[PDB]
Amino acid sequence: SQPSTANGGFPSVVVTAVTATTSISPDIESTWKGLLAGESGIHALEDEFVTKWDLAVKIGGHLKDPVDSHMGRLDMRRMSYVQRMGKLLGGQLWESAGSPEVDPDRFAVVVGTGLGGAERIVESYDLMNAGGPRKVSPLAVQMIMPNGAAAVIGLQLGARAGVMTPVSAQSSGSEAIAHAWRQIVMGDADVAVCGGVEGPIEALPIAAFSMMRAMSTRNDEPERASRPFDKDRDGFVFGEAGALMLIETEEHAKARGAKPLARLLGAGITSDAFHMVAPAADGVRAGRAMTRSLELAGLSPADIDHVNAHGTATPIGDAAEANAIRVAGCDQAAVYAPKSALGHSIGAVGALESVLTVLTLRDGVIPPTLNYETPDPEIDLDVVAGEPRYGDYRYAVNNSFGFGGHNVALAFGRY
Amino acid sequence: SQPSTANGGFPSVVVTAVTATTSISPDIESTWKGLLAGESGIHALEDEFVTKWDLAVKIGGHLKDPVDSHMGRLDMRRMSYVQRMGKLLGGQLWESAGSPEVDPDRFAVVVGTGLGGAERIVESYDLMNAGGPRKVSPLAVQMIMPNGAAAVIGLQLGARAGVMTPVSAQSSGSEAIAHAWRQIVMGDADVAVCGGVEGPIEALPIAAFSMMRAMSTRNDEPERASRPFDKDRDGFVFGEAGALMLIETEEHAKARGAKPLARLLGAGITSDAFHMVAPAADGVRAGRAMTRSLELAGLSPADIDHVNAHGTATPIGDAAEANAIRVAGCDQAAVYAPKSALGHSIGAVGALESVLTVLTLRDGVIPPTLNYETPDPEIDLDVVAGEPRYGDYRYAVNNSFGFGGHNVALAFGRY
Numbered sequence: 133s134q135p136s137t138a139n140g141g142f143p144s145v146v147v148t149a150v151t152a153t154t155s156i157s158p159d160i161e162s163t164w165k166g167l168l169a170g171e172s173g174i175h176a177l178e179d180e181f182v183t184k185w186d187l188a189v190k191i192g193g194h195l196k197d198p199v200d201s202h203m204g205r206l207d208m209r210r211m212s213y214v215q216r217m218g219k220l221l222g223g224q225l226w227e228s229a230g231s232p233e234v235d236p237d238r239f240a241v242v243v244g245t246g247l248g249g250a251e252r253i254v255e256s257y258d259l260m261n262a263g264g265p266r267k268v269s270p271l272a273v274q275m276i277m278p279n280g281a282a283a284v285i286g287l288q289l290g291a292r293a294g295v296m297t298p299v300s301a302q303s304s305g306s307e308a309i310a311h312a313w314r315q316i317v318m319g320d321a322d323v324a325v326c327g328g329v330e331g332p333i334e335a336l337p338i339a340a341f342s343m344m345r346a347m348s349t350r351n352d353e354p355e356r357a358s359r360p361f362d363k364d365r366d367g368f369v370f371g372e373a374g375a376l377m378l379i380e381t382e383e384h385a386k387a388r389g390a391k392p393l394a395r396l397l398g399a400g401i402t403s404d405a406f407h408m409v410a411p412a413a414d415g416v417r418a419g420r421a422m423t424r425s426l427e428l429a430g431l432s433p434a435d436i437d438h439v440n441a442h443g444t445a446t447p448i449g450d451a452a453e454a455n456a457i458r459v460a461g462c463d464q465a466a467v468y469a470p471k472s473a474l475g476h477s478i479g480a481v482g483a484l485e486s487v488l489t490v491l492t493l494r495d496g497v498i499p500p501t502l503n504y505e506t507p508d509p510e511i512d513l514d515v516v517a518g519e520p521r522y523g524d525y526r527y528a529v530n531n532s533f534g535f536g537g538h539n540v541a542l543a544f545g546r547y
Numbered sequence: 548s549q550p551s552t553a554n555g556g557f558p559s560v561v562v563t564a565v566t567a568t569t570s571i572s573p574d575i576e577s578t579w580k581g582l583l584a585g586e587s588g589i590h591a592l593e594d595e596f597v598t599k600w601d602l603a604v605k606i607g608g609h610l611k612d613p614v615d616s617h618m619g620r621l622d623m624r625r626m627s628y629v630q631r632m633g634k635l636l637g638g639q640l641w642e643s644a645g646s647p648e649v650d651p652d653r654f655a656v657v658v659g660t661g662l663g664g665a666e667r668i669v670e671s672y673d674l675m676n677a678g679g680p681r682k683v684s685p686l687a688v689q690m691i692m693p694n695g696a697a698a699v700i701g702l703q704l705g706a707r708a709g710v711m712t713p714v715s716a717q718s719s720g721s722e723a724i725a726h727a728w729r730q731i732v733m734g735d736a737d738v739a740v741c742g743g744v745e746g747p748i749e750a751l752p753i754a755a756f757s758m759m760r761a762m763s764t765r766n767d768e769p770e771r772a773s774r775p776f777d778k779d780r781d782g783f784v785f786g787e788a789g790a791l792m793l794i795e796t797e798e799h800a801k802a803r804g805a806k807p808l809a810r811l812l813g814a815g816i817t818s819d820a821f822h823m824v825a826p827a828a829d830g831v832r833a834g835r836a837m838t839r840s841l842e843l844a845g846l847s848p849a850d851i852d853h854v855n856a857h858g859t860a861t862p863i864g865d866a867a868e869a870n871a872i873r874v875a876g877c878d879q880a881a882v883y884a885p886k887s888a889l890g891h892s893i894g895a896v897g898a899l900e901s902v903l904t905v906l907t908l909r910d911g912v913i914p915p916t917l918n919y920e921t922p923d924p925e926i927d928l929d930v931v932a933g934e935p936r937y938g939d940y941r942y943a944v945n946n947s948f949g950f951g952g953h954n955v956a957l958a959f960g961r962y
């Protein structure tokens with residue numbers, strides 16, 4: 133008979149530390165309290181930047197605390213932005229975990245991003261066009277390579293049981309946590325730092341996503357712009373983030389006196405084969421990723437008390453996801469869509485929302501989905517709105533999807 | 548007991564089709580005959596950018612048959628180069644496999660690459676700089692994203708059991724195969740297209756890698772520049788390539804009448820935590836990735852008849868790998884270093900070399916390692932040289948390594 137977490141085929145895996153930098157706060161516990169108070173991280177983009185390009189999109193959430201304010205002259209010259217974010221969060225995470233001494237040979241790193249050190253691609257291009265190949269830095273390739281951020285974290289923390297970077301566009305941060313779990317349950321590590329990092333709001337990324345019509349243009353009320361599952365939604369809002377969690381076998385946590393925040397029970401990864409930038413409208417393959425996470429966790433759909441939705445606020449996006457949740461037997465769960473308050477951090481967002489899912493399970497509370505005012509009859513979901521929803525949440529699925537047709541679901545459990 | 552392939556704990560997985568494009572030939576079987584004939588793919592760079600840029604490196608192997616001679620206006624417009632390569636190889640592989648009707652819900656794609664459609668990053672940057680945000684194509688994000696090539700193949704072939712892109716620099720192509728094996732043995736798929744694709748030789752990649760002093764500058768004699776394990780090696784040579792293989796459960800292959808070319812028995816992924824762009828001299832973590840693939844295969848070091856070496860021809864890289872092979876107890880195996888003839892295709896290379904490992908087992912022969920004229924006194928390996936070696940190769944390990952400190956070993960068996 134097939135292994136599951138419930139039957140003990142797989143070892144039990146626990147979340148023991150979380151860290152995240154957001155548009156609300158650099159401290160995850162403060163982001164969480166803010167969220168519960170109904171605060172938004174979204175603001176007006178300031179301004180001559182927007183004028184310089186007359187961008188259609190004039191709103192987004194920058195990190196409350198900029199990464200580079202913790203970065204010295206050397207690191208600014210020698211790392212890409214995602215590498216600086218990764219190093220910053222990795223050490224904060226390790227601190228929060230009590231700086232444990234782990235066996236490096238059983239310690240893995242899995243961190244996704246959407247792109248990597250792309251700014252260094254354009255910088256190096258400009259440098260060579262102007263002064264030739266001798267103007268390109270010896271450090272360019274290590275800064276540009278998309279595995280750069282995971283590699284800096286593995287080097288910083290001493291991980292010798294594998295350093296991996298799955299790229300799946302907007303599902304990359306969840307997919308990293310899926311693979312870290314796989315790597316533990318398969319026996320290749322006992323402990324893993326996992327999550328996602330992403331670059332900051334910039335003009336060429338706004339222009340690229342804007343030109344697809346994917347983004348909100350409700351510029352007059354920035355906090356009201358990201359409206360997942362709401363009838364008047366008009367696309368996603370950028371909101372900067374990066375987020376990492378520490379996961380380990382329950383045995384490993386026990387031996388060092390770490391108190392678990394949640395259980396990571398299982399993970400499902402499927403694909404649509406439908407379109408490169410539109411999700412399958414039927415939500416069938418997306419719902420099967422949820423189902424697969426349950427099969428591995430040893431749960432039934434009826435066991436799911438909460439779904440932390442990808443919910444980007446695009447018209448077709450939220451609709452396909454509503455169909456996915458119905459397909460999964462999960463449409464009676466309380467649904468939260470965090471992008472309403474924190475916006476979209478692309479490669480980091482899945483990791484961020486995984487942390488949020490953990491805090492929901494830990495605290496028995498789901499924050500309100502902001503801007504949810506006019507129910508959409510094609511979205512027949514129990515969307516948490518108005519005030520937080522308190523409850524004895526025992527099991528939860530965090531969904532993430534990505535351009536390319538990527539579907540990731542993570543089954544978490546209260547500890 | 549933990550599962551292995553040998554004890555029936557993991558389902559049996561076979562390789563049923565292979566495809567590759569190479570500096571020697573567009574056809575893998577032709578490339579193979581070429582290698583056995585002692586042919587090199589490496590030539591003088593004739594791109595007028597060499598003098599346009601006065602590059603320190605003036606050698607490499609372009610693909611014998613350029614990808615874009617198979618591409619029409621439409622494909623030229625909507626795909627980045629690695630996407631065009633993937634579509635090309637994807638269709639070729641499927642046709643070679645006899646265009647099987649498989650279950651799309653049990654069919655996965657795992658294709659690695661080093662960077663993605665980075666030429667559309669610089670294109671879009673230039674466009675926006677010259678004409679504003681509206682000069683950025685609606686297609687740019689999906690072309691740029693490093694998961695683009697895997698997604699194109701998944702959409703092309705109809706894969707709905709997951710589409711993944713592991714990025715680990717020069718080991719990406721091997722890691723992709725490792726993860727596709729994991730997806731089948733964990734029960735998520737019964738069949739998978741896997742491998743790696745990479746961009747062509749261009750001025751900016753030469754500049755970046757040549758500023759690391761990583762590349763050979765033996766410009767007078769292109770075919771003699773790539774010298775893995777040789778005392779006179781002075782770095783690596785670019786040789787373009789892309790390569791995919793079809794793997795499926797032995798049961799799935801039997802059902803459709805597909806004759807296996809080899810068995811894929813096990814995969815090991817570890818990390819050095821030593822340096823971003825240099826391997827740990829001790830070869831200890833690299834050796835452990837070999838050992839791990841053996842554990843999972845159910846093999847011992849004595850069973851390993853052949854090692855397909857990453858063998859870049861850098862001074863410190865070959866030295867580190869020779870330590871790794873010894874650590875793994877595999878130093879009595881017959882060693883091939885294919886980059887001697889085919890050069891380095893970065894994100895595609897581990898997949899190409901996994902294909903060549905499969906063929907070694909199929910045909911019971913290892914091609915000669917070119918340029919091996921003065922064995923490095925400090926490296927004592929049985930490097931195959933001079934003429935191909937006909938031998939009873941039962942089992943083989945393919946090694947790949949990547950900037951970031953990534954170690955991937957694939958354990959293959961004769962069918």
Ligand SMILES: C=C/C(C)=C/[C@@]1(C)SC(=O)C(C)=C1O
Nearest residue numbers: 302409410411449533534537
């Ligand atoms: C295959 C296409 C998919 C998953 C598209 C989604 C819904 S995922 C995402 O973050 C955005 C912006 C979308 O549009």
Ligand SMILES: C=C/C(C)=C/[C@@]1(C)SC(=O)C(C)=C1O
Nearest residue numbers: 717824825826864948949952
């Ligand atoms: C951690 C660094 C490693 C593995 C570096 C290697 C050996 S891998 C590779 O492809 C090349 C060109 C190198 O120099």
Ligand code: NA
Nearest residue numbers: 440441442485
């Ligand atoms: Na989510």
Ligand code: NA
Nearest residue numbers: 855856857900
């Ligand atoms: Na190899």
